[PDB]
Amino acid sequence: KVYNDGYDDDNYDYIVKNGEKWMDRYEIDSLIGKGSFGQVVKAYDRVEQEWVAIKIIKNKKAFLNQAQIEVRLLELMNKHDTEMKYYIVHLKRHFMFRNHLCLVFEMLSYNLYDLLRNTNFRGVSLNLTRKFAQQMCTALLFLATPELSIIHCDLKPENILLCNPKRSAIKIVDFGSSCQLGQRIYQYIQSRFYRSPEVLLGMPYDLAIDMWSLGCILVEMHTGEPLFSGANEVDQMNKIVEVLGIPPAHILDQAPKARKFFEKLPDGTWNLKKTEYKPPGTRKLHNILGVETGGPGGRRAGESGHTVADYLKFKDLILRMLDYDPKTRIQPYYALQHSFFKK
Ligand SMILES: CCOc1cc(/C=C2\SC(=S)NC2=O)ccc1O
């Protein structure tokens, strides 16, 4: 059997051969990314004389359609003249090659999960976390612009990449799961660890879900471990409740999936259903962050910029990003005005 004249495998992924040249321009070096959508490869562009990442979409209608949306959003974002756009990954060009849609991006360095792995999952400093935090809030502010109103929908450490390995500048990648503000066609969205409560509760969602994700990411970056690492959605919600308490009554009353995690008593109050968890709100972020005990695990004790005063600024901001209510949850503009960022 042969697929796409022998260019494709059984999955209709392009069979990548190191050293291959495409259209007398791009020289394929190696495969750098693998996904349901297709593959990502590192290539040299002879014309621009630079390294580029090429996202090779699978040769199937479904995956092509998904990527077409990705392209519109990427091109829409690149359209704006604002300087905030530079925190978003830049799509240089797109083309059809051997029945595969290919997105050409600027080559980027290690993702934030790689950084975590490199620390043996013990996290990076508050100073570097602040730098990452400021850039991400700026990125979300840009996404929040009315013309765009883009929800990334899959924010996580892996999806945040450094421009250069020796600088701290970051760019958000993978808009393949992104959508614009509108009707909640998709209920099951976001990576589980970074999934907002509104999504878990099957309620309407806005751009605030990304902000929730950011809060989880920022805590994760400093500690090295996901704030909430549920094995399932129920476990996810229970892990959120451990830190933040039972969600407010006004939310759960409106929540279609409230009874998946909670039960409503005769008095009309909400409790966790029975089916190993600390009581609601007793896994304090104050202690997770090690505000008063020299940071997480005491590894930051004696380090500049790791004072109680510093940690309290970080904690307050995080707690504003992890507001249960998406209408009151801090917005990118206000987050950038937080005392955590002041000099
Ligand atoms: C290992 C992936 O490395 C890169 C990845 C991207 C962008 C991607 S990957 C994906 S999946 N969707 C994107 O937009 C850009 C530059 C890179 O160096």
Distances from the Cα of 123 to the Cα of 117, 260, 295, 318, angstroms: 9, 33, 11, 16
Place of tokens 């450490």: 157
Place of tokens 């209510």: 325
* Residue 125, CA atoms < 13 Å, CB-side half-sphere: 12
- Quick one: which atom of ligand 1 is closest to the CA of 42? 18
Report the chain's terminal Cα–Cα distance, integer Å: 64
Place of tokens 């950011």: 214
At residue 21, what are phi and psi to the nearest 5 degrees?
A: -110, 130
Best residue among 57, 72, 105 to mutate for probing ligand 1, ranked by most atoms within 8 Å of CB: 105
Residue 123, classified by CB atoms within 10 Å of its CB into exposed (0-12), middle (13-18) or buried (19+), is buried
Q: Identify the structural domains of the chain with CATH numbers, from first to last.
A: 4-106 (1.10.510.10), 112-341 (1.10.510.10)
For residue 284, report the distance from its CA to the centre of ligand 1, in Å.
Answer: 35
Lining ligand 1 with CB less than 6 A are: 32-33, 35, 40, 53, 55, 89, 105, 107-108, 173-176
Closest CA to 285 of 340, 239, 339, 237: 239
Give the SS3 label for residue 111: strand
For residue 35, report the distance from its CA to the centre of ligand 1, in Å.
Answer: 11
Give the SS3 label for residue 325: coil
- Quick one: which atom of ligand 1 is closest to the CA of 105? 15
Long-range contact list for 210-213, CB < 8 A, 24+ apart? 210/140, 210/143, 210/151, 210/152, 210/153, 210/155, 211/140, 211/321, 211/329, 211/330, 211/331, 211/332, 211/335, 212/321, 212/322, 212/326, 212/329, 213/152, 213/155, 213/156
Q: In whole angstroms, what is the distance from residue 126 CA to residue 122 CA?
A: 12
Cβ atoms of 223 and 296 closer than 8 Å: yes
Closest CA to 214 of 154, 170, 261: 154
Long-range contact list for 195-198, CB < 8 A, 24+ apart? 195/233, 195/236, 196/326, 197/237, 197/240, 197/247, 197/251, 197/324, 198/251, 198/326
Long-range contact list for 288-292, CB < 8 A, 24+ apart? 288/219, 288/223, 288/227, 288/243, 289/219, 289/222, 289/223, 289/314, 289/315, 289/318, 291/315
For residue 33, report the distance from its CA to the centre of ligand 1, in Å.
Answer: 7
Cβ atoms of 223 and 214 closer than 8 Å: no
Identify the residue whose C-alpha is closest to ligand 1 atom 12.
174
Cβ atoms of 219 and 209 closer than 8 Å: no
Q: In whole angstroms, what is the distance from residue 133 CA to residue 221 CA?
A: 10
The residues that are catalytic are: 154
- As beta bridge partners, residue 264 has 270
Can you state the angle between helices 126-143 and 308-321, rounded to 10 degrees? 30
Method underlying the structure: X-ray
